[PDB]
Paper text:
GALK1 is a small molecule kinase of the GHMP kinase family, which catalyzes the MgATP-dependent phosphorylation of the C-1 hydroxyl of α-d-galactose to yield Gal-1-P in the Leloir pathway. In classic galactosemia, GALT enzymatic deficiency causes the accumulation of Gal-1-P, the product of the enzyme galactokinase 1 (GALK1; EC 2.7.1.6) upstream of GALT in the Leloir pathway. Inhibition of human GALK1 (hGALK1) to prevent Gal-1-P production therefore could provide a therapeutic benefit for GALT deficiency. Here, we determined crystal structures of hGALK1 bound with reported ATP-competitive inhibitors of the spiro-benzoxazole series, to reveal their binding mode in the active site.
To this end, we co-crystallized hGALK1 with two spiro-benzoxazole inhibitors (T1 and T2), in the presence of galactose, and determined their crystal structures to 2.44 and 2.10 Å resolution, respectively. T1 and T2 share the chemical scaffold of a benzoxazole ring connected to a tetrahydroquinazolinone ring by an amide linker, and both compounds are found to occupy the ATP binding site in a similar manner. The benzoxazole ring, mimicking the adenine moiety of ATP, sits in a hydrophobic pocket forming a π–π stacking interaction with Trp106 and van der Waals interactions with Val129 and Leu145. Importantly, the quinazolinone cyclohexanone and spiro-ring substituents cause displacement of two key side-chains—Arg105 and Arg228—at the entrance of the ATP site. In our costructures, both Arg105 and Arg228 are sequestered away from the ATP phosphate groups, to accommodate the quinazolinone ring of the compounds. For T2 with the larger spiro ring, the carbonyl moiety is close enough to hydrogen bond with the Arg105 guanidino side chain (dotted line). Therefore, these residues are sequestered away from catalysis in the inhibitor-bound complexes. ATP-titration experiments with T2 showed no significant change in Vmaxapp (P = 0.1801) and a significant increase in Kmapp (P < 0.0001), collectively indicating competitive inhibition with ATP by T2, which is supported by fitting in GraphPad Prism and is in agreement with its binding mode in our hGALK1 crystal costructure. We found that hGALK1 co-crystallized with galactose and T2 produced the required quantity (crystals in the hundreds) and diffraction quality (consistently better than 2.5 Å) for the screening campaign. To bias hits toward allosteric binding, we soaked compounds into hGALK1 co-crystals with galactose and T2 occupying the active site.
Author numbering: 0 to 392
The structure:
Amino acid sequence: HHAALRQPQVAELLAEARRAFREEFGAEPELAVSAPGRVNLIGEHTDYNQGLVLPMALELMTVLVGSPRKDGLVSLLTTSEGADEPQRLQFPLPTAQRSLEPGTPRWANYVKGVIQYYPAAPLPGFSAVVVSSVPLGGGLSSSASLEVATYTFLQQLCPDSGTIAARAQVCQQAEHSFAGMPCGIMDQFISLMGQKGHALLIDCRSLETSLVPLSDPKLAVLITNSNVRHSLASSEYPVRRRQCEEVARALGAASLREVQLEELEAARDLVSKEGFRRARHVVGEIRRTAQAAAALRRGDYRAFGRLMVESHRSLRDDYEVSCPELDQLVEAALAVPGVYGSRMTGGGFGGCTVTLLEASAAPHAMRHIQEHYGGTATFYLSQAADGAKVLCL
Ligand SMILES: O=C1CCCC2=C1C1(CCCCC1)N=C(Nc1nc3ccccc3o1)N2
Ligand SMILES: OC[C@H]1O[C@@H](O)[C@H](O)[C@@H](O)[C@H]1O
């Protein structure tokens, strides 16, 4: 099997969500919102180091459809097959007396976290159906898209008077506290600020962002899901953060963004062998991401793709967050004529690779990758998509 997976269009997700809502609450929902998943083109394990990242939002998205309530109740239904039980859930709005807490089902910890830290009041209660085409925990940020869709819904109930970064950070806080995943800010930011036909260069120190056109009929972004997820993934992520902090402290730096590749080379003995390799990835990856944005600006897909491949080797050998399945998928992809570059994307230890290629080479690329992969790969061909949006029903 080597054809791209169906990507449900928005009209399909809306129809499903409204049918599930009518059938469950006996009336037509009044509001719809959505927020997408994402793929990171380059700039991996840099966001929590205040570095640069270059993601784009995907046509895979999460949809909320719902209505405000007057009884201070939050009533949730999700139609997503792989969400853990129960898929119906209710709880009253938190107060200074009773705050929400992480519990079961896990998929609602994302919604609760966001309601809990939502910065404006008064928030009414609401009824809402959650649908999503983002493969749950597939490495394309299903949780961030649920958080951001929830945030975008709350804004319709109680407008915040805030900024995009504040919203991303609310959603990042929910991830940290209600899901126990100490992520950076990239996934929430792109889900919030994506735009069709654009990648988003995010400066995670200044919080400056740039919408870089990424729309060329002859260019494709191929996402390949390894469909494996090593247990190591969850546990090594904080180990990598902590190794990064060690090097930053040793160089007297607020973060590794403040550390130049040449300052690192000059301070080997102040840090371990492993910590040095981890910082060398991060420092070089920040520089590669800036160079990739420039390459994209001039339409230099060959240079962009070479930087991707250097990003992969750095992640495999210096940061050690790849795995044999990702490495095989990358090497397979790079043997296909028309492919500019390929690399793991997201956190690592499983999940997806991202491949930049000539659009006409996509059918060959998918066949060749599948035939040279010991597992069962899944594929997405995605254009750069919109971030969070609202449709009044
Ligand atoms: O178990 C893990 C491990 C860490 C990554 C991750 C999860 C699970 C969360 C619990 C249910 C299945 C998997 N879900 C997400 N994201 C997500 N779940 C959603 C449910 C409905 C709508 C949109 C959703 O996005 N991420
Ligand atoms: O670049 C690695 C990325 O891994 C993601 O899973 C994480 O949520 C992001 O914040 C980023 O750190």
